[PDB]
């Protein structure tokens, strides 16, 4: 019943994926050694969604994890939840990427591209009806960003009907940790806009401007960002895993959210966020959670949504409310701020509304949305691109990968189209 | 004698099912295990077995299980035939596209084997009362590949419509008037008498009559069910003048194409508000043509009346009937059209309306169903035209209609039905 | 021939809708003629069969002000092929001195124009 | 309803807020843990949540942190919202020029956005209380830039200003008149109604009456937020002739640029003194006209009265006001304004004052609030026009303004426009 397949891809994917692992165990009330512990059944019935069930009634999560070097693996099998993973599902090589696209997408991925197919195709033939593929990934270096794209590419090719939604953190100036991240970024979006149905755009600077500036956070480490990542990734899917008074699974996003096919790469956000004195004093009635939600600080994103317009927005709310101040905040929201909506499409949102919210919440909002603006990332990306393609450096280490000029050519091409196509509708 | 098959489809359709069985188990005494404690009164819409058990005749079809499945669970989940609430695999991605063409079709054919299986016990059958909303991907395209082959399979049966229809202003969906918009060619070509339901006006009357601040969905229902079995009353207890389903329906119709009528139930009335009011038969009969009681979010005062109904139900005697209608038609506001200056027609039924123990609604003795057809409502279709404009005008989502099998013209044909379904509501009130 | 608009039309066109025989009681114009239902009226003295007043409530609040003056900008407007913006109706619908003068000023010109017309 | 958001500005603003929350808590008996041991008559000035805690609608702003982060350490630490109460990081220096320029403009946006989201849960919200002090570069530079865009931000709100006023004589700064003379363009254009507060007064108030030869601020901030919460009484608390906030203002203001009321309060006396009085309606009645308890070092008896109102609070019977104030007008030594023969305005609340258990001030069963405009106060003006003379004369003190980015010129508007409401309000005294 809509089974979901998850993939790990590089550090960055496989990390972020197993923290989501443990936030959904808890929720679903799984023990760290795979048995069930949850307090009501509504926990049970869609299982299914996520775990395979299996003798003893222990319940094993349908996630293949990818890489290119064991040491993720190691860390991933001695993390806090490395047991419950599929031993069989830890397929990796033993020499790394080095952070080169080229690496994962020809060489040092295409020979594990086989033994990532076999696995992933077990996984959806052990489903009843399955729904999609959530990817986990990242832009940066060419591990998640080289043999992602590739994979994905398969799965897109034998799969063309599933829902393909990926969420990909990807590169940013000031807090770049590598060099070479603008040729992977380029590299990858080129395939992500033509195969993926969604993109859910991560930027690590706006996760740190959460963490500061609304969590005040003194030392906020990289696990807080994987937190922050994985609260909209379970947000998004929790339509088909729970009731809700308006039902709206992956599809049922997809057919209000983006207008056009390419258009797909989209804003998510989620609340509330408060630091640890000041949840004491915050009322978290829905209204304040919506003020909350619309905030250029409760992004993922460097992509200040005031400057574009919003295309289609997704307001998945969570928790035992009634829903009219839902329409009259989605309404005044769009009304007020009509300047921030295109006009020319009149109701920008879609909500939903589930009944059982998150353990230790009795509500929750998450935040997904189109708008215009998500360019700043794409044309400031392409504009570093053009700062090291322009006139050849770091090339001998893709070339001599088998890549090639004319294929860069195309990629920052296809970044300028897609550009192009979010500054038309602004 | 009189069954009536009840229809629904989507997840407004199954959940107003829910609230309007809930409803009917009460008013017709049955346990929510199908038992009867202690006429034929549920031959209407409960069949009976040897053992002593109320079975109804309902079908709910959802393309996804989650409130199927959620009614599995619930208290009725042993009232329903398990089999003929049938559940999909796939949801209709608030699509008419898929809906019509490609995940309803391999289920519609269990539907209607279900639905003959209804049929063949129903020795007076007299019409269906399938219930959808406009706006959802199910509601619009498996009912529009339901309704084409039941007016083959059932062409002579009455097919009452009553749908959800998108407001002016609140909306759940950005798609929901591409989907409104495909539902028009069945109601104009198999529909006998459609029955459209606003969620804003409906709000504003919780909001003022009822004076609750927080309602749900659950409130509206338990409103769209008195309306229902209020429109049901007369074939199922005795009055003095009841009016058969395809009387009240030859009532409505001026022309086969004309068949929109609004509703508006009265007393719509809180608890702490019943104790301090008389509430005569004329109060109620005033309240209903009021715009602040509106079912759709149109004024009626914009428009003019062709044909009016008074369902009237409790203790109730027709010359007070006679007495409101005479001041109704007194006062000019309220302007007829020329067709109808006898204007109105009258239903008188004994039964007290019955309220829902959870509900909002205030117990009354007297209970009026308003249904009445106006030139006023081509406004609630003159903003979703030149709304469905405003995305048609860039083909704003059809790749996903079309690439689930629709013809990129029959949004051509869907918006020149809808004009001309306009135009035929103008000439008319000349 | 005056280019622009001189204080003295504005009394011209004061005087002119007294001359009218309107039912309407001793109350100024500039904050009768902001209900909407007026401006039917005056026009009910040329063509009756086009007023309905079977679609206009008088009222006097807002909300029921300018959902009669969006009622009559499709209904009777657009049959003189006069079309106006929200932000200047709101305006009328505030009993805005000039706002609906403005409004007041053509509105007649057109009706004189219906009339000369040859309509068959 | 009848919410108001309380500004405090300034090291002045955040200490007689310290003061005034001490008072509201009690008066309207918080914990100052914020919680109610055991009416809706707190909505005016506390928000409340789920659990039972009432959270001020209240911003300390101070572009130092030392007096806001002492509060941090305070018995009201957790009272207040902790991140609604800014600090900056640089101080005012006493210079308008970096308050309203250089060091206020950083910290403004987050001010704003904090007035905004204490905004949007007022339902019925009322005005503005914003404190501060003329003298000190915070209470005036950073007031001069908030009440700017407050008031295109909240143009339509009331906005009252309550002010610490500099003495003819005691002064604790050299530039003091600077900073107040840049003020003026501030009260008269962005402000409704301006309360002006002199130290060197109520130094003599505080010596008389109370008998106390050795008091603090904290004595002078346990009246003014008497003299606030007084003028506050009615919005709160229940009365026989309770005045509206816009009642209030539309009775004190003749024209919109007069809006300068003096205040005193009654009765002012300490806690041996209070029992070999009755202390009479009348007696409070004619203390609050006796120059030697004016809160501004300005002779009455020296002006015109033109707008007097009466906010009695406690147990007073308005016959007696009326009694009281026949003989006000009856003596020739108060002289109103040929404008107002019917003088006075009267107001009276049923909650007897509050008194604060560390304070200076008696319990007395009767208080009344004394707020009135007079032509005397130009006085407290025309001693500060001459002292700024004496200073711009060889541009005293200007290179610091001028290096913070002030035009030099500035001033010169500041004179021209202090001249302008010195002639203002003599032209009206005839
Ligand atoms: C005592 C109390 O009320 O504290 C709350 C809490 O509400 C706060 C402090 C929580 C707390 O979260 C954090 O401290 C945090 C730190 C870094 C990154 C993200 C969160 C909390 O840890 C998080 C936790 O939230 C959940 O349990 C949700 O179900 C969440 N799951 C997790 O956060 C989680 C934590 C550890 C292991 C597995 C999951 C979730 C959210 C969305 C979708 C699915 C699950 C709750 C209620 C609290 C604490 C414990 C302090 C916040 O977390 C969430 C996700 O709601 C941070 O801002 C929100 C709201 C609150 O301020
Ligand atoms: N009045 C009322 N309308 C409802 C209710 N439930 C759903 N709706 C309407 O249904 C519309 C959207 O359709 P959906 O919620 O998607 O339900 P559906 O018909 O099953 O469509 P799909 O989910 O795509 O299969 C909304 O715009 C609502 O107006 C209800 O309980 N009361
Ligand atoms: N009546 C009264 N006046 C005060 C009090 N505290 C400060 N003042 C006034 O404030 C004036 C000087 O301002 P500051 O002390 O510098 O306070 P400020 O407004 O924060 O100005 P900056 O310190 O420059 O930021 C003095 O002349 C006093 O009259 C108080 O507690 N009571
Ligand atoms: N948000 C977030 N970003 C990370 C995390 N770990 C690493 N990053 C950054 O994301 C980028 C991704 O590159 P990387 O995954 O190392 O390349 P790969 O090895 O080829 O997959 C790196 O440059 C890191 O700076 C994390 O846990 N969260
Ligand atoms: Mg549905
Ligand atoms: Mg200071």
């Given at each position: 019943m809509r089974e979901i397949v998850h993939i790990q891809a590089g550090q960055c994917g496989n990390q972020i994926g197993a923290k989501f692992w443990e936030v959904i165990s808890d929720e679903h009330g799984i023990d760290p050694t795979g048995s069930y512990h949850g307090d009501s059944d509504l926990q049970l019935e869609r299982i299914n969604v996520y775990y395979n069930e299996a003798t003893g009634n222990k319940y094993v999560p349908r996630a293949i994890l990818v890489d290119l070097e064991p040491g993720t693996m190691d860390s991933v099998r001695s993390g806090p939840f490395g047991q419950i993973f599929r031993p069989d599902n830890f397929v990796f090589g033993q020499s790394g990427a080095g952070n080169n696209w080229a690496k994962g997408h020809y060489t040092e991925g295409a020979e594990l591209v086989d033994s990532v197919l076999d696995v992933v195709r077990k996984e959806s033939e052990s489903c009843d009806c399955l729904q999609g593929f959530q990817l986990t990934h990242s832009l940066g270096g060419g591990t998640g960003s080289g043999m992602g794209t590739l994979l994905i590419s398969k799965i897109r090719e034998e799969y063309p009907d599933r829902i393909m939604?990926?969420?990909?953190?990807?590169?940013?100036?000031?807090?770049?940790?590598?060099?070479?991240?603008?040729?992977?970024?380029?590299?990858?979006?080129?395939?992500?806009?033509?195969?993926?149905?969604?993109?859910?755009?991560?930027?690590?600077?706006?996760?740190?401007?959460?963490?500061?500036?609304?969590?005040?956070?003194?030392?906020?480490?990289?696990?807080?960002?994987?937190?922050?990542?994985?609260?909209?990734?379970?947000?998004?899917?929790?339509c088909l895993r729970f009731p809700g008074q308006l039902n709206a699974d992956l599809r049922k996003l997809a057919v209000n959210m983006v207008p056009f096919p390419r258009l797909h790469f989209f804003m998510p956000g989620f609340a509330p966020l408060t630091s640890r004195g000041s949840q004491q004093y915050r009322a978290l009635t829905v209204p304040e959670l919506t003020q909350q939600m619309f905030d250029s600080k409760n992004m993922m994103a460097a992509c200040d949504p005031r400057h574009g317009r919003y295309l289609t927005v997704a307001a998945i709310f969570r928790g035992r409310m009634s829903m009219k101040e839902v329409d009259e905040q989605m309404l005044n929201v769009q009304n007020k701020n009509s300047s921030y909506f295109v006009e020319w499409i009149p109701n920008n949102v879609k909500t939903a509304v589930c009944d059982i919210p998150p353990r230790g919440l009795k509500m929750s909002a998450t935040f997904i949305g189109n708008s215009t603006a998500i360019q700043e990332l794409f044309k400031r990306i392409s504009e570093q691109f053009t700062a090291m393609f322009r006139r050849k450096a770091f090339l001998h280490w893709y070339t001599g990968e088998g890549m090639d000029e004319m294929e860069f050519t195309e990629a920052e091409s296809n970044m300028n189209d897609l550009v192009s196509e979010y500054q038309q509708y602004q | 004698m009189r069954e009536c098959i009840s229809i629904h489809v989507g997840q407004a359709g199954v959940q107003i099912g829910n609230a309007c069985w809930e409803l009917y188990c009460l008013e017709h005494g049955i346990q929510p295990d199908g038992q009867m404690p202690s006429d034929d009164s549920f031959n209407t819409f409960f069949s009976e077995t040897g053992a002593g058990k109320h079975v109804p005749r309902a079908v709910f079809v959802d393309l996804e299980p989650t409130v199927i499945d959620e009614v599995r669970t619930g208290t009725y989940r042993q009232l329903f035939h398990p089999e003929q609430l049938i559940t999909g695999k796939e949801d209709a991605a608030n699509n008419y596209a898929r809906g019509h063409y490609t995940i309803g079709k391999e289920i519609i054919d269990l539907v209607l084997d279900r639905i003959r299986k209804l049929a063949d016990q129903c020795t007076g059958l007299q019409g269906f009362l399938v219930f959808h909303s406009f706006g959802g991907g199910t509601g619009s395209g498996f009912t529009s590949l339901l309704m084409e082959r039941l007016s083959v399979d059932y062409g002579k049966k009455s097919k009452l419509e009553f749908s959800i229809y998108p407001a002016p202003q609140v909306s759940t969906a950005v798609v929901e008037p591409y989907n409104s918009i495909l539902t028009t060619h069945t109601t104009l070509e198999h529909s006998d008498c459609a029955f459209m339901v606003d969620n804003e006006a409906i709000y504003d009357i919780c909001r003022r009559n009822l004076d609750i601040e927080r309602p749900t969905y659950t409130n509206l229902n338990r409103l769209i069910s008195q309306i229902v079995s209020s429109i049901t009353a007369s074939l199922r207890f005795d009055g003095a003048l009841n009016v058969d389903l395809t009387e009240f329906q030859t009532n409505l119709v001026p022309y086969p194409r004309i068949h929109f009528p609004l509703a508006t139930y009265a007393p719509v009335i809180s608890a702490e508000k019943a104790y301090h009011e008389q509430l005569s038969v004329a109060e109620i009969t005033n309240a209903c043509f009021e715009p602040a009681n509106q079912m759709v979010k149109c004024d009626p005062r914009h428009g003019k009346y062709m044909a009016c109904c008074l369902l009237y139900r409790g203790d109730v005697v027709p010359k007070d009937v006679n007495a409101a209608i005479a001041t109704i038609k007194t006062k000019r506001s309220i302007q007829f059209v020329d067709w109808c200056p006898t204007g109105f027609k009258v239903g008188i039924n004994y039964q007290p309306p019955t309220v829902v123990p959870g509900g909002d609604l205030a117990k009354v003795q007297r209970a009026v169903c308003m249904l009445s057809n106006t030139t006023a409502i081509a406004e609630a279709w003159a903003r979703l035209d030149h709304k469905f404009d405003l995305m048609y005008a860039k083909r704003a989502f059809v790749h996903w209609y079309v690439g689930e099998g629709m013809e990129e013209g029959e949004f051509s044909e869907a918006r020149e039905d809808m004009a001309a379904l306009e135009k035929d509501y103008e000439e008319v009130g000349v | 021939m005056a280019s622009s608009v001189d204080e003295e039309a504005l009394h011209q066109l004061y005087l002119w809708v007294d001359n009218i025989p309107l039912s309407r009681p001793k109350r100024n114009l500039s904050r009768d003629f902001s209900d909407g239902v007026l401006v039917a009226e005056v026009i009910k003295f040329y063509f009756p069969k086009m007023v309905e007043m079977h679609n206009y409530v008088p009222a006097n609040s807002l909300q029921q002000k300018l959902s009669n003056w969006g009622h009559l900008n499709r209904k009777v407007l657009k049959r003189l092929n006069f079309s106006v913006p929200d932000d200047v109706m709101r305006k009328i619908a505030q009993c805005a001195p000039g706002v609906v003068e403005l409004v007041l000023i053509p509105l007649r010109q057109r009706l004189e124009e219906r009339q000369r017309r040859r309509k068959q």
């Open positions: 939604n990926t969420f990909s953190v990807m590169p940013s100036p000031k807090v770049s940790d590598t060099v070479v991240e603008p040729y992977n970024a380029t590299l990858s979006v080129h395939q992500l806009v033509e195969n993926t149905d969604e993109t859910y755009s991560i930027d690590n600077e706006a996760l740190y401007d959460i963490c500061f500036r609304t969590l005040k956070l003194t030392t906020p480490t990289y696990g807080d960002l994987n937190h922050l990542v994985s609260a909209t990734m379970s947000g998004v899917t929790t | - | -």
